[PDB]
């Protein structure tokens, strides 16, 4: 609708149009590493992206989405805390105006420079739109970004951003391999939560990887040249498109690792 990240339409305003913003399972959250309990019942995460077929990249005025063909069983997330099979539909990032902020989840109150979200829907609900209406409809794999060495697998994304500067622009983006965005380790934390953008639906199993990826300062600087505005509108840099941590309420965060 007209929500965004500014002083006048940002996270503190969202509840007026999306009252679930004050709900019982909102995301993101601070991950208190000492309180998160190791769960030996948790399985290794199975990330099967060998046949992923990226299609397009879109500036939607909030972030940019790299979209996948999800019409066949091709890029799936399984195992971990999940029951069943979840299909990759898109990924996007949240990032800051400065390297000291940008992530949505925090780790013992630490903010990372950015956070990648790989969004998957539970195939038992047939389509993404039906899945978001279910408490176990989505699985979002979250990966922190810190600034250091460049991430070679990110560069193809960085280089297409000049072609989608403004809201509503898209570009063909085929043959992109999202495996190049993963860290070495698949150790994770998990908890039940929500979309971090309106409509804030409480339909997500969050899986947040412990190990951040490193990206270069130049890579994140190019994220910060994107625009929230449309073409021919006053320039508003796309920065600080993150929701802050929300109350944990009656939830437990579980760790896959000791
Ligand atoms: N930051 S995050 O929690 O990873 C967003 C997860 C994916 C939301 C996609 C959408 B797409 B359609 B259904 C769900 B609602 B509509 B539009 B609205 B947008 B929101
Ligand atoms: N609850 S919500 O969806 O976050 C909407 C909150 C009020 C939106 C009103 C506006 B729209 B954008 B930003 C704020 B300034 B500019 B245009 B102007 B009108 B007023
Ligand atoms: Zn997100």
Swiss-Prot record:
Changing residue 119 to A/G/I/L/S: Reduced CO(2) hydrase and p-nitrophenyl acetate esterase activities. It holds the Pfam family Carb_anhydrase. The record marks 5, 60, 65 as: Fine-tunes the proton-transfer properties of H-64. Gene3D superfamilies: Alpha carbonic anhydrase (3.10.200.10). Changing residue 140 to H: Impaired activity. Changing residue 195 to F: Normal activity. It is an enzyme of class 4 (lyase). Changing residue 196 to S/V: Reduced activity. Zn(2+) binds at residues 92, 94, 117. Interacts with SLC4A4. Interaction with SLC4A7 regulates SLC4A7 transporter activity. Interacts with SLC26A6 isoform 4 (via C-terminus cytoplasmic domain). This is Carbonic anhydrase 2. It comes from Homo sapiens.
């Amino acid at each position: 609708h007209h929500w965004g990240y500014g002083k006048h339409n940002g996270p503190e305003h969202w509840h007026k149009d999306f009252p679930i913003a004050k709900g019982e399972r909102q995301s993101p959250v601070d991950i208190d590493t000492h309180t998160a309990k190791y769960d030996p019942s948790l399985k290794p995460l199975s990330v099967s992206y060998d046949q992923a077929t990226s299609l397009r990249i879109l500036n939607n005025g909030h972030a940019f989405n790299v979209e996948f063909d999800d019409s066949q069983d091709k890029a799936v997330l399984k195992g971990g805390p999940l029951d069943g099979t979840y299909r990759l539909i898109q990924f996007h990032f949240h990032w800051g105006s400065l390297d000291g902020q940008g992530s949505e989840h925090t780790v013992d109150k630490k903010k990372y420079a950015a956070e990648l979200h790989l969004v998957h829907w539970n195939t038992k609900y047939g389509d993404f739109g039906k899945a978001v209406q279910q408490p176990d409809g989505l699985a979002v794999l979250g990966i922190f970004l810190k600034v250091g060495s460049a991430k070679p697998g990110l560069q193809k994304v960085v280089d297409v951003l000049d072609s989608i500067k403004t809201k509503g622009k898209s570009a063909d983006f085929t043959n992109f391999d999202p495996r190049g965005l993963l860290p070495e380790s698949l150790d994770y934390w998990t908890y039940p939560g929500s979309l971090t953008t309106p409509p804030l639906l409480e339909c997500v199993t969050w899986i947040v990887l412990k190990e951040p990826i490193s990206v270069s300062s130049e890579q994140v600087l190019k994220f910060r040249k994107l625009n929230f505005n449309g073409e021919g509108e006053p320039e508003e840099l796309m920065v600080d498109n993150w929701r802050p941590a929300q109350p944990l309420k009656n939830r437990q965060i579980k760790a896959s690792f000791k």
